[PDB]
């Protein structure tokens, strides 16, 4: 019953490649990603207003 | 082409690192309570 006592917290957000490339050194291992598969249509758990 | 996703690679120099499966297991354990709660909000 306390937010501070929580061990973990997980959030899902929409992002594009340009956002990740804004900070190139921050993110590693970008080439292996399959961009086409990871779309709001393919993820049913994410709740969004994008058509 | 098509490099294999989930090809293991050590990102950091920590003695013990998390790896993806631990985090996904935590998410799948925590999900049932969240799903039960969301019904009331809906």
């Amino acid at each position: 019953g306390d937010i501070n006592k929580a061990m973990f917290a997980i959030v899902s957000f929409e992002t594009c490649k340009a956002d990740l490339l804004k900070e190139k050194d921050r993110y590693h291992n970008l080439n292996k990603i399959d961009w086409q598969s990871s779309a709001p249509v393919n993820e049913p758990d994410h709740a969004t207003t994008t058509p | 082409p098509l490099p294999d996703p989930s090809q293991a690679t050590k990102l950091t120099s920590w003695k013990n690192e998390l790896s993806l499966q631990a985090l996904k297991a935590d998410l799948d354990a925590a999900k049932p309570s969240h799903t039960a709660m969301m019904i009331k909000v809906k």
Binding site: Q36, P44 | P1, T35, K42
Partner: peptide, 27 residues
């Protein structure tokens, strides 16, 4: 008289290997 769970069972999308290979030319 029977509680109805909401989250329904959904199947994923079949993986496709031949389409990524092909290049596209505009007509």
């Amino acid at each position: 008289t029977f509680f109805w769970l909401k989250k329904a069972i959904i199947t994923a999308r079949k993986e496709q290997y031949f389409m990524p290979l092909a290049s596209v030319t505009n007509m």
